[PDB]
Amino acid sequence: SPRVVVIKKGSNGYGFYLRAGPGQIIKDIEPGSPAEAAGLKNNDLVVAVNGKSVEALDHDGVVEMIRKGGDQTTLLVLDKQEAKL
């Protein structure tokens, strides 16, 4: 399920980790972080950064796109749609 998450960088960054999924996925959102306030979710899959696709881009390339944006990042993400029932 897709959405656009704008996050303003704080004094200690955005407050999430980025690593390869089972693409690059969000992990370990820090409580009280800009990422948490922006509604980013653990296991969100990053499909674009600042309007640019991350297709076939490696981990370092995705991280660099995020850093190049300076004090803000706009992530297009797909939530993991696996429900525990």
Side-chain angles (χ1 to χ4, degrees):
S1 180
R3 94 196 160 277
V4 179
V5 187
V6 186
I7 321 177
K8 190 213 184 305
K9 197 204 272 175
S11 56
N12 297 291
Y14 298 111
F16 66 94
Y17 296 71
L18 190 81
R19 71 157 289 122
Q24 298 288 306
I25 290 197
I26 307 301
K27 295 286 200 185
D28 300 316
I29 289 164
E30 305 274 7
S33 63
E36 188 176 71
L40 195 65
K41 283 304 193 204
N42 294 150
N43 296 330
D44 279 354
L45 176 65
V46 176
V47 300
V49 173
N50 304 149
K52 299 298 189 227
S53 174
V54 298
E55 63 200 344
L57 203 53
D58 67 13
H59 171 77
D60 291 348
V62 178
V63 171
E64 182 60 14
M65 279 202 173
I66 295 164
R67 295 190 191 293
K68 280 181 177 166
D71 286 332
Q72 175 189 312
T73 197
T74 300
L75 306 178
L76 178 65
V77 299
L78 300 175
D79 298 346
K80 191 170 175 184
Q81 285 197 301
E82 183 166 32
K84 194 165 185 312
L85 293 166

Coordinates of all heavy atoms in Angstrom, one line a residue:
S1 N 0.9 -1.2 0.0 CA 0.0 0.0 0.0 C 0.9 1.2 0.0 O 1.7 1.4 0.9 CB -0.9 0.1 1.2 OG -1.7 1.2 1.2
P2 N 0.7 2.2 -1.0 CA 1.6 3.3 -1.1 C 1.3 4.6 -0.3 O 0.2 5.0 -0.2 CB 1.6 3.7 -2.6 CG 0.6 2.9 -3.2 CD -0.1 2.0 -2.2
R3 N 2.4 5.3 0.1 CA 2.2 6.7 0.5 C 3.5 7.5 0.5 O 4.6 6.9 0.4 CB 1.4 6.9 1.8 CG 2.3 7.0 3.1 CD 1.5 6.8 4.4 NE 2.5 6.5 5.3 CZ 3.0 5.3 5.4 NH1 2.4 4.3 4.8 NH2 4.1 5.0 6.2
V4 N 3.3 8.8 0.6 CA 4.4 9.8 0.5 C 4.6 10.3 1.9 O 3.7 10.8 2.5 CB 4.1 10.9 -0.4 CG1 5.2 11.9 -0.4 CG2 3.8 10.4 -1.8
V5 N 5.8 10.1 2.4 CA 6.2 10.5 3.8 C 7.3 11.6 3.7 O 8.4 11.4 3.3 CB 6.7 9.3 4.6 CG1 6.9 9.7 6.1 CG2 5.6 8.2 4.6
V6 N 6.9 12.8 4.0 CA 7.9 13.9 4.1 C 8.4 14.0 5.6 O 7.6 14.0 6.5 CB 7.2 15.3 3.8 CG1 8.2 16.4 3.7 CG2 6.4 15.2 2.4
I7 N 9.7 14.0 5.7 CA 10.3 14.1 7.0 C 11.4 15.2 7.1 O 12.3 15.3 6.3 CB 11.1 12.8 7.4 CG1 10.3 11.5 6.9 CG2 11.3 12.7 8.9 CD1 11.0 10.2 7.1
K8 N 11.3 16.1 8.1 CA 12.2 17.1 8.3 C 13.3 16.6 9.2 O 13.0 16.0 10.3 CB 11.5 18.3 8.9 CG 12.4 19.6 9.0 CD 12.0 20.5 10.2 CE 12.8 21.8 10.2 NZ 14.3 21.7 10.1
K9 N 14.5 16.9 8.9 CA 15.7 16.3 9.6 C 15.8 17.1 10.9 O 15.7 18.4 10.9 CB 16.9 16.4 8.7 CG 18.1 15.5 9.2 CD 19.4 16.0 8.7 CE 19.8 15.4 7.4 NZ 21.1 16.0 6.9
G10 N 16.0 16.4 12.0 CA 16.3 17.0 13.3 C 17.8 17.1 13.6 O 18.6 16.8 12.8
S11 N 18.0 17.4 14.8 CA 19.4 17.5 15.3 C 20.1 16.2 15.3 O 21.4 16.1 15.2 CB 19.5 18.2 16.7 OG 18.7 17.4 17.6
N12 N 19.4 15.1 15.5 CA 19.9 13.7 15.4 C 19.4 12.9 14.2 O 19.1 11.7 14.4 CB 19.7 13.0 16.8 CG 20.4 13.7 18.0 OD1 21.6 13.7 18.0 ND2 19.6 14.2 18.9
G13 N 19.3 13.6 13.1 CA 18.8 12.9 11.9 C 17.3 12.7 11.9 O 16.6 13.4 12.5
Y14 N 17.0 11.7 11.1 CA 15.5 11.4 10.9 C 15.0 10.4 11.9 O 13.9 10.5 12.3 CB 15.2 10.9 9.5 CG 15.6 11.8 8.4 CD1 16.7 11.6 7.5 CD2 14.8 12.9 8.2 CE1 17.0 12.5 6.5 CE2 15.1 13.8 7.2 CZ 16.2 13.6 6.4 OH 16.6 14.5 5.4
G15 N 15.9 9.5 12.4 CA 15.5 8.6 13.4 C 15.0 7.2 12.8 O 14.1 6.6 13.3
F16 N 15.7 6.7 11.8 CA 15.4 5.4 11.3 C 16.7 4.8 10.7 O 17.7 5.4 10.4 CB 14.3 5.3 10.2 CG 14.6 6.0 8.9 CD1 15.2 5.4 7.9 CD2 14.4 7.4 8.7 CE1 15.4 6.0 6.6 CE2 14.7 8.0 7.5 CZ 15.2 7.3 6.5
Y17 N 16.6 3.5 10.5 CA 17.7 2.7 9.8 C 17.1 2.2 8.5 O 16.0 2.0 8.3 CB 18.1 1.5 10.7 CG 18.8 1.9 12.0 CD1 18.1 2.4 13.0 CD2 20.2 1.8 12.1 CE1 18.7 2.7 14.2 CE2 20.8 2.1 13.4 CZ 20.0 2.6 14.4 OH 20.5 3.0 15.6
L18 N 18.1 2.2 7.5 CA 17.8 1.7 6.2 C 18.7 0.5 5.9 O 19.9 0.6 5.9 CB 18.0 2.8 5.2 CG 17.5 2.5 3.8 CD1 16.0 2.7 3.7 CD2 18.2 3.4 2.8
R19 N 18.1 -0.6 5.5 CA 18.8 -1.8 5.1 C 18.1 -2.6 4.1 O 16.9 -2.4 3.8 CB 19.1 -2.7 6.3 CG 17.9 -3.4 6.9 CD 18.1 -4.6 7.7 NE 18.6 -5.7 6.9 CZ 19.8 -6.3 7.1 NH1 20.5 -6.0 8.1 NH2 20.1 -7.3 6.3
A20 N 18.7 -3.6 3.4 CA 18.1 -4.4 2.4 C 17.0 -5.2 3.0 O 17.0 -5.7 4.2 CB 19.1 -5.3 1.7
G21 N 15.9 -5.4 2.3 CA 14.8 -6.2 2.7 C 15.0 -7.7 2.5 O 16.1 -8.1 1.9
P22 N 14.0 -8.5 2.8 CA 14.0 -10.0 2.5 C 14.3 -10.3 1.0 O 13.7 -9.6 0.2 CB 12.6 -10.4 2.9 CG 12.2 -9.4 3.9 CD 12.8 -8.1 3.5
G23 N 15.4 -4.6 -2.4 CA 15.0 -3.2 -2.1 C 15.5 -2.8 -0.7 O 16.1 -3.6 0.0
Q24 N 15.4 -1.5 -0.4 CA 15.8 -1.0 0.9 C 14.5 -0.7 1.8 O 13.6 -0.1 1.3 CB 16.6 0.3 0.7 CG 17.9 0.1 0.0 CD 18.9 -0.7 0.8 OE1 19.2 -0.2 1.9 NE2 19.5 -1.8 0.3
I25 N 14.6 -1.2 3.0 CA 13.5 -1.2 3.9 C 13.9 -0.4 5.2 O 15.0 -0.3 5.6 CB 13.0 -2.6 4.2 CG1 12.3 -3.2 3.0 CG2 12.0 -2.6 5.4 CD1 11.4 -4.4 3.3
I26 N 12.9 0.2 5.8 CA 13.0 1.0 7.1 C 13.0 0.0 8.2 O 12.2 -0.9 8.3 CB 11.8 1.9 7.2 CG1 11.6 2.8 6.0 CG2 11.8 2.7 8.5 CD1 12.7 3.7 5.7
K27 N 13.9 0.2 9.1 CA 14.0 -0.5 10.4 C 14.2 0.4 11.6 O 14.8 1.5 11.5 CB 15.1 -1.5 10.4 CG 14.9 -2.7 9.3 CD 13.8 -3.7 9.8 CE 13.9 -5.0 9.1 NZ 12.7 -5.8 9.6
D28 N 13.7 -0.1 12.7 CA 14.1 0.4 14.0 C 13.8 2.0 14.1 O 14.7 2.7 14.5 CB 15.5 0.1 14.4 CG 15.8 -1.5 14.4 OD1 14.9 -2.2 15.0 OD2 16.8 -1.9 13.8
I29 N 12.6 2.4 13.7 CA 12.3 3.8 13.9 C 12.4 4.2 15.4 O 12.0 3.4 16.3 CB 10.9 4.1 13.4 CG1 10.8 4.1 11.8 CG2 10.4 5.5 13.9 CD1 9.4 4.0 11.3
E30 N 13.1 5.3 15.7 CA 13.4 5.7 17.1 C 12.2 6.4 17.7 O 11.6 7.4 17.1 CB 14.6 6.5 17.2 CG 15.9 5.9 16.6 CD 16.6 5.0 17.5 OE1 16.1 4.8 18.6 OE2 17.8 4.6 17.2
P31 N 11.8 6.1 18.9 CA 10.7 6.8 19.5 C 11.0 8.2 19.7 O 12.1 8.5 20.1 CB 10.6 6.1 20.9 CG 11.2 4.9 20.7 CD 12.2 4.9 19.7
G32 N 10.1 9.1 19.4 CA 10.3 10.5 19.6 C 11.0 11.2 18.4 O 11.4 12.4 18.5
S33 N 11.2 10.4 17.3 CA 12.0 10.9 16.2 C 11.1 11.6 15.2 O 9.9 11.4 15.2 CB 12.7 9.8 15.4 OG 11.8 8.9 14.9
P34 N 11.7 12.4 14.3 CA 10.9 13.0 13.2 C 10.3 11.9 12.3 O 9.1 12.0 11.9 CB 12.0 13.8 12.4 CG 13.0 14.2 13.5 CD 13.1 13.0 14.3
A35 N 10.9 10.8 12.1 CA 10.4 9.7 11.3 C 9.1 9.1 12.0 O 8.1 8.9 11.3 CB 11.5 8.6 11.1
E36 N 9.2 8.9 13.3 CA 8.0 8.5 14.0 C 6.8 9.5 13.8 O 5.7 9.2 13.5 CB 8.3 8.2 15.4 CG 7.1 7.5 16.1 CD 7.4 7.1 17.5 OE1 7.6 8.0 18.3 OE2 7.5 5.8 17.8
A37 N 7.1 10.8 14.1 CA 6.1 11.9 14.0 C 5.5 11.9 12.6 O 4.4 12.3 12.4 CB 6.7 13.2 14.4
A38 N 6.3 11.6 11.6 CA 5.9 11.7 10.1 C 5.1 10.5 9.7 O 4.6 10.4 8.6 CB 7.1 11.9 9.2
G39 N 5.0 9.5 10.6 CA 4.2 8.2 10.3 C 4.9 7.3 9.4 O 4.3 6.4 8.8
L40 N 6.2 7.3 9.3 CA 7.0 6.3 8.7 C 6.8 5.0 9.5 O 6.6 5.1 10.7 CB 8.5 6.7 8.6 CG 9.3 5.8 7.7 CD1 8.9 6.0 6.2 CD2 10.8 6.2 7.9
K41 N 6.8 3.9 8.9 CA 6.6 2.6 9.6 C 7.8 1.6 9.3 O 8.3 1.5 8.2 CB 5.3 2.0 9.1 CG 4.0 2.6 9.7 CD 4.1 2.6 11.2 CE 2.7 2.9 11.8 NZ 2.8 3.5 13.2
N42 N 8.1 0.9 10.4 CA 9.0 -0.2 10.2 C 8.6 -1.2 9.1 O 7.4 -1.4 8.9 CB 9.2 -1.0 11.5 CG 9.9 -0.2 12.6 OD1 9.6 -0.4 13.8 ND2 10.8 0.7 12.2
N43 N 9.5 -1.7 8.3 CA 9.3 -2.5 7.1 C 8.8 -1.9 5.9 O 8.5 -2.5 4.9 CB 8.5 -3.8 7.5 CG 9.2 -4.7 8.5 OD1 10.4 -4.7 8.5 ND2 8.4 -5.4 9.3
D44 N 8.6 -0.5 5.9 CA 8.2 0.2 4.8 C 9.3 0.0 3.7 O 10.5 0.1 4.1 CB 8.0 1.7 5.0 CG 6.7 2.0 5.6 OD1 5.9 1.1 5.7 OD2 6.4 3.2 6.0
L45 N 8.9 -0.2 2.5 CA 9.9 -0.4 1.4 C 10.0 0.9 0.6 O 9.0 1.5 0.2 CB 9.3 -1.4 0.4 CG 10.1 -1.7 -0.8 CD1 11.5 -2.2 -0.5 CD2 9.4 -2.6 -1.8
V46 N 11.2 1.4 0.5 CA 11.5 2.7 -0.2 C 11.5 2.5 -1.7 O 12.4 1.7 -2.2 CB 12.7 3.4 0.3 CG1 13.0 4.6 -0.5 CG2 12.6 3.7 1.8
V47 N 10.6 3.1 -2.4 CA 10.5 3.0 -3.9 C 11.0 4.3 -4.6 O 11.3 4.2 -5.8 CB 9.3 2.4 -4.4 CG1 9.1 1.0 -3.8 CG2 8.0 3.3 -4.0
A48 N 11.0 5.4 -4.0 CA 11.5 6.6 -4.5 C 11.9 7.5 -3.4 O 11.4 7.5 -2.3 CB 10.5 7.3 -5.4
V49 N 12.9 8.4 -3.7 CA 13.4 9.4 -2.8 C 13.4 10.7 -3.5 O 14.0 10.9 -4.6 CB 14.8 9.1 -2.3 CG1 15.4 10.3 -1.5 CG2 14.9 7.8 -1.5
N50 N 12.7 11.7 -2.9 CA 12.6 13.0 -3.5 C 12.1 13.0 -5.0 O 12.6 13.8 -5.8 CB 13.9 13.8 -3.4 CG 14.3 13.9 -1.9 OD1 15.5 13.9 -1.6 ND2 13.4 14.0 -1.0
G51 N 11.2 12.1 -5.3 CA 10.6 12.0 -6.6 C 11.4 11.2 -7.6 O 11.0 11.1 -8.7
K52 N 12.5 10.6 -7.2 CA 13.3 9.8 -8.1 C 13.3 8.3 -7.7 O 13.5 8.0 -6.5 CB 14.8 10.3 -8.0 CG 14.9 11.8 -8.4 CD 14.5 12.1 -9.8 CE 14.8 13.5 -10.2 NZ 13.7 14.2 -10.9
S53 N 13.0 7.5 -8.7 CA 13.0 6.1 -8.4 C 14.3 5.5 -7.9 O 15.4 5.9 -8.4 CB 12.7 5.3 -9.7 OG 12.8 3.9 -9.6
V54 N 14.2 4.6 -7.0 CA 15.4 3.8 -6.5 C 15.5 2.4 -7.1 O 16.3 1.6 -6.6 CB 15.5 3.8 -5.0 CG1 15.6 5.2 -4.5 CG2 14.2 3.1 -4.4
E55 N 14.8 2.2 -8.3 CA 15.0 1.0 -9.1 C 16.4 0.7 -9.3 O 17.2 1.5 -9.8 CB 14.2 1.2 -10.4 CG 14.7 2.3 -11.4 CD 13.7 2.8 -12.4 OE1 12.7 2.1 -12.7 OE2 14.0 3.8 -13.1
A56 N 16.8 -0.6 -9.0 CA 18.2 -1.0 -9.4 C 19.4 -0.2 -8.8 O 20.5 -0.3 -9.2 CB 18.4 -1.2 -10.9
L57 N 19.0 0.7 -7.8 CA 20.0 1.4 -7.1 C 20.4 0.6 -5.8 O 19.6 0.0 -5.2 CB 19.4 2.7 -6.6 CG 20.3 3.9 -6.3 CD1 21.3 4.3 -7.4 CD2 19.3 5.1 -6.1
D58 N 21.7 0.5 -5.5 CA 22.2 -0.2 -4.4 C 22.1 0.5 -3.1 O 21.6 1.7 -3.1 CB 23.6 -0.8 -4.7 CG 24.7 0.4 -4.7 OD1 24.5 1.5 -4.3 OD2 25.8 0.1 -5.2
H59 N 22.3 -0.1 -2.0 CA 22.1 0.5 -0.7 C 22.8 1.8 -0.6 O 22.2 2.8 -0.1 CB 22.7 -0.5 0.4 CG 22.8 0.1 1.7 ND1 21.7 0.3 2.6 CD2 23.9 0.6 2.4 CE1 22.1 0.8 3.7 NE2 23.4 1.0 3.6
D60 N 24.1 1.9 -1.0 CA 24.8 3.1 -0.9 C 24.2 4.3 -1.7 O 24.1 5.4 -1.3 CB 26.3 3.0 -1.3 CG 27.1 2.2 -0.3 OD1 26.6 1.9 0.8 OD2 28.3 1.9 -0.7
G61 N 23.6 3.9 -2.9 CA 23.0 4.9 -3.8 C 21.7 5.4 -3.2 O 21.5 6.6 -3.3
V62 N 21.0 4.6 -2.5 CA 19.7 5.1 -1.9 C 20.1 6.0 -0.7 O 19.5 7.0 -0.5 CB 18.8 3.9 -1.4 CG1 17.5 4.5 -0.8 CG2 18.4 3.0 -2.7
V63 N 21.0 5.6 0.2 CA 21.4 6.4 1.3 C 21.9 7.8 0.7 O 21.5 8.8 1.3 CB 22.5 5.6 2.1 CG1 23.2 6.6 3.2 CG2 22.0 4.4 2.7
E64 N 22.7 7.8 -0.3 CA 23.2 9.0 -0.8 C 22.1 9.9 -1.4 O 22.1 11.1 -1.2 CB 24.3 8.7 -2.0 CG 24.9 10.0 -2.5 CD 25.7 10.8 -1.5 OE1 26.0 10.5 -0.4 OE2 25.9 11.9 -2.0
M65 N 21.1 9.4 -2.0 CA 20.0 10.2 -2.5 C 19.3 10.9 -1.3 O 18.9 12.0 -1.3 CB 18.9 9.3 -3.2 CG 19.1 9.0 -4.5 SD 17.4 8.6 -5.3 CE 17.9 8.5 -7.0
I66 N 19.2 10.1 -0.2 CA 18.6 10.7 1.0 C 19.5 11.8 1.6 O 19.0 12.9 1.9 CB 18.2 9.6 2.1 CG1 17.1 8.7 1.6 CG2 17.8 10.3 3.4 CD1 17.1 7.4 2.4
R67 N 20.8 11.6 1.7 CA 21.6 12.6 2.2 C 21.7 13.8 1.3 O 21.8 15.0 1.8 CB 23.0 12.0 2.4 CG 23.2 10.9 3.4 CD 24.7 10.7 3.5 NE 24.9 9.4 4.3 CZ 24.7 9.2 5.6 NH1 24.1 10.1 6.4 NH2 25.0 8.0 6.0
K68 N 21.6 13.6 0.0 CA 21.7 14.8 -0.9 C 20.6 15.8 -0.8 O 20.7 17.0 -1.2 CB 21.8 14.3 -2.4 CG 23.2 13.8 -2.8 CD 23.1 13.4 -4.2 CE 24.5 13.0 -4.7 NZ 24.5 12.2 -6.0
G69 N 19.5 15.4 -0.3 CA 18.3 16.2 0.0 C 18.4 17.2 1.1 O 17.5 18.0 1.4
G70 N 19.5 17.1 1.9 CA 19.8 18.1 2.9 C 18.9 17.9 4.1 O 19.0 16.8 4.8
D71 N 18.1 18.9 4.5 CA 17.4 18.9 5.8 C 16.0 18.3 5.7 O 15.3 18.4 6.7 CB 17.4 20.3 6.4 CG 18.8 20.7 7.0 OD1 19.5 19.7 7.4 OD2 19.1 21.9 7.0
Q72 N 15.7 17.6 4.6 CA 14.4 17.0 4.5 C 14.5 15.9 3.5 O 15.5 15.8 2.7 CB 13.4 18.1 4.0 CG 12.0 17.6 3.6 CD 11.2 18.8 2.9 OE1 11.3 19.9 3.4 NE2 10.7 18.5 1.8
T73 N 13.7 14.9 3.7 CA 13.6 13.8 2.7 C 12.1 13.5 2.4 O 11.3 13.5 3.4 CB 14.4 12.6 3.1 OG1 14.6 11.7 2.0 CG2 13.8 11.7 4.2
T74 N 11.8 13.2 1.2 CA 10.4 12.8 0.9 C 10.5 11.4 0.3 O 11.0 11.1 -0.8 CB 9.8 13.7 -0.2 OG1 9.8 15.0 0.4 CG2 8.4 13.3 -0.5
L75 N 9.9 10.4 1.1 CA 10.0 9.0 0.8 C 8.7 8.5 0.2 O 7.7 8.7 0.8 CB 10.4 8.2 2.0 CG 11.7 8.6 2.7 CD1 11.9 7.7 3.9 CD2 12.9 8.6 1.8
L76 N 8.8 7.8 -1.0 CA 7.6 7.1 -1.5 C 7.8 5.7 -1.0 O 8.8 5.1 -1.4 CB 7.5 7.3 -3.0 CG 6.4 6.5 -3.6 CD1 5.0 7.1 -3.2 CD2 6.6 6.6 -5.2
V77 N 6.8 5.2 -0.2 CA 7.0 3.9 0.4 C 5.8 3.0 0.1 O 4.7 3.5 -0.2 CB 7.2 4.0 1.9 CG1 8.5 4.8 2.3 CG2 6.0 4.6 2.6
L78 N 6.0 1.7 0.2 CA 5.0 0.7 0.2 C 5.0 0.1 1.6 O 6.1 -0.4 2.1 CB 5.2 -0.3 -0.8 CG 5.2 0.1 -2.3 CD1 5.6 -1.0 -3.2 CD2 3.9 0.7 -2.6
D79 N 3.9 0.1 2.3 CA 3.8 -0.6 3.6 C 3.9 -2.1 3.3 O 3.5 -2.6 2.3 CB 2.5 -0.3 4.3 CG 2.4 1.2 4.6 OD1 3.4 2.0 4.6 OD2 1.2 1.6 5.0
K80 N 4.4 -2.9 4.3 CA 4.3 -4.3 4.3 C 2.8 -4.5 4.7 O 2.3 -4.1 5.7 CB 5.3 -4.9 5.2 CG 5.4 -6.4 5.0 CD 6.5 -7.0 5.8 CE 6.5 -8.5 5.7 NZ 7.6 -9.2 6.5
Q81 N 2.2 -5.2 3.8 CA 0.8 -5.5 3.9 C 0.8 -7.0 4.3 O 0.3 -7.9 3.5 CB 0.0 -5.2 2.7 CG -0.3 -3.7 2.5 CD -1.4 -3.5 1.6 OE1 -1.3 -3.9 0.4 NE2 -2.5 -2.8 2.1
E82 N 1.3 -7.3 5.4 CA 1.1 -8.6 6.0 C 0.5 -8.4 7.4 O 1.0 -7.6 8.2 CB 2.4 -9.4 6.1 CG 2.2 -10.8 6.7 CD 3.4 -11.7 6.5 OE1 4.6 -11.2 6.6 OE2 3.2 -12.9 6.4
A83 N -0.7 -8.9 7.6 CA -1.4 -8.7 8.8 C -1.3 -9.9 9.7 O -1.6 -11.0 9.3 CB -2.9 -8.5 8.5
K84 N -0.9 -9.7 11.0 CA -1.0 -10.7 12.0 C -2.5 -10.7 12.6 O -3.0 -9.7 13.0 CB -0.1 -10.4 13.2 CG 0.1 -11.6 14.1 CD 1.3 -11.4 15.0 CE 1.6 -12.6 15.9 NZ 0.3 -13.1 16.6
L85 N -3.1 -11.9 12.4 CA -4.5 -12.1 12.9 C -4.7 -13.1 13.9 O -3.8 -14.0 14.2 CB -5.3 -12.4 11.6 CG -5.4 -11.2 10.7 CD1 -6.0 -11.6 9.3 CD2 -6.3 -10.1 11.3

